[PDB]
Design a protein around this ligand. Structure first.
Ligand SMILES: COc1ccc2c3ccnc(Cl)c3n(CC#N)c2c1
Length: 349
């Protein structure tokens, strides 16, 4: 049963072969990544004399047409940003090869999941978490500039890569899920752990959904574990409710899928759906305090940062305050990137 003349496999992916030369130019070293979109390979560019990364989009229409948007958007961002400046991966060129759209990128280093893993999920320091937060907020400031108005739509540790193994410099990758403020084209989006209330609730969204993600990410970066590790949409919403409480009546009143997670009393207040059989699985609303998760006054997450430098209680109080502003239920009031950069948490040395 041949797929695309035997170049693809049963899942519309190109069968990678180490040492293959493409178009008398690119030498394929190895497979280095995978995802919904397809594959990413490490390759040497004879012409330019450099190592690159080539993202090999799946050979199917729906997946192609989506990478076409990733290209349009990267080209548009690299056009403003021609100093490789603003914390966004660089699209060198692209081409069609054996019926696969291939995108050639600069070669980058570890993503932030690999980096968490490397500490055996103990978390990185608060100092380092600050650096990622400063850059990510700046990248998100960039994305918001009115010419662009770009929603990334799938922020997560795995889509933030270091430039260099032993350095804090980072770039955001994978704009395959991405869109612009007007041209909104989907319902079920963002990775689940990093999905915003408004998306869960089936409401319309804007750029603020990335900020939500960013909040989930920064906590995870310092503690080692996802702030809201939900196994599906109902679990996920419930894990958020543990920490932050019930979402304001004015939001739920507008949410088409409010009733998937909640129910409205006779008196007009909302509450979690009534459950069953003397079962209890979650902590009551608002009870899982972020104050304890970060371990503000107990030596950091898990007491593992006890009596270290640059982890004072004050550092944590700032860091906490920022994060609660990033996780505001209301997207009209969730801190925006301009203002986040001015937050106390960055006041200098
Ligand atoms: C390790 O170097 C790179 C460089 C660019 C990319 C890159 C660019 C656009 N989209 C994705 Cl998903 C990208 N990955 C994912 C992986 N693995 C990259 C990895």
């Amino acid at each position: 049963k041949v797929y695309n003349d035997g170049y693809d496999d049963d899942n519309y992916d190109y069968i990678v072969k180490n040492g293959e030369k493409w178009m008398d130019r690119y030498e394929i070293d190895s497979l280095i990544g995978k995802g919904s979109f397809g594959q990413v390979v490490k390759a040497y560019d004879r012409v330019e004399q450099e190592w690159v990364a080539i993202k090999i989009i799946k050979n199917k229409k729906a997946f192609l047409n989506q990478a076409q948007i990733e290209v349009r958007l990267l080209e548009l961002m690299n056009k403003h940003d021609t100093e490789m400046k603003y914390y966004i991966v660089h699209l060198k060129r692209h081409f069609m090869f054996r019926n696969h759209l291939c995108l050639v990128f600069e070669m980058l280093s570890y993503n932030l999941y690999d980096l968490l893993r490397n500490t055996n999920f103990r978390g990185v320091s608060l100092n380092l978490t600050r650096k990622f937060a400063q850059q990510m907020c700046t990248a998100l400031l960039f994305l918001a500039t009115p010419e662009l108005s770009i929603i990334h739509c799938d922020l997560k540790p795995e889509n933030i890569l270091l430039c260099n193994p032993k350095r804090s410099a980072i770039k955001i990758v994978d704009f395959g899920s991405s869109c612009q403020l007007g041209q909104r084209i989907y319902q079920y989006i963002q990775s689940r752990f990093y999905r915003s209330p408004e998306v869960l609730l089936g409401m319309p969204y804007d750029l603020a959904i990335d900020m939500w993600s960013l909040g989930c990410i920064l906590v995870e970066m310092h503690t080692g574990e996802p702030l809201f590790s939900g196994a599906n949409e109902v679990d996920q919403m419930n894990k958020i409710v543990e920490v932050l409480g019930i979402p304001p009546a004015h939001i739920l009143d507008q949410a088409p899928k409010a009733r998937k997670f909640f129910e409205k009393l006779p008196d007009g207040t909302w509450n979690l759906k009534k459950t069953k059989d003397g079962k209890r699985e979650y902590k009551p609303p608002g009870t899982r305090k972020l104050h304890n998760i970060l371990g503000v006054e107990t030596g950091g997450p898990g007491g593992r940062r006890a009596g270290e430098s640059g982890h004072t209680v004050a550092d944590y109080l700032k860091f906490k305050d920022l994060i609660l502003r990033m996780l505001d239920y209301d997207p009209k009031t969730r801190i925006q990137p301009y203002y986040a950069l001015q937050h106390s948490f960055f006041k200098k040395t």
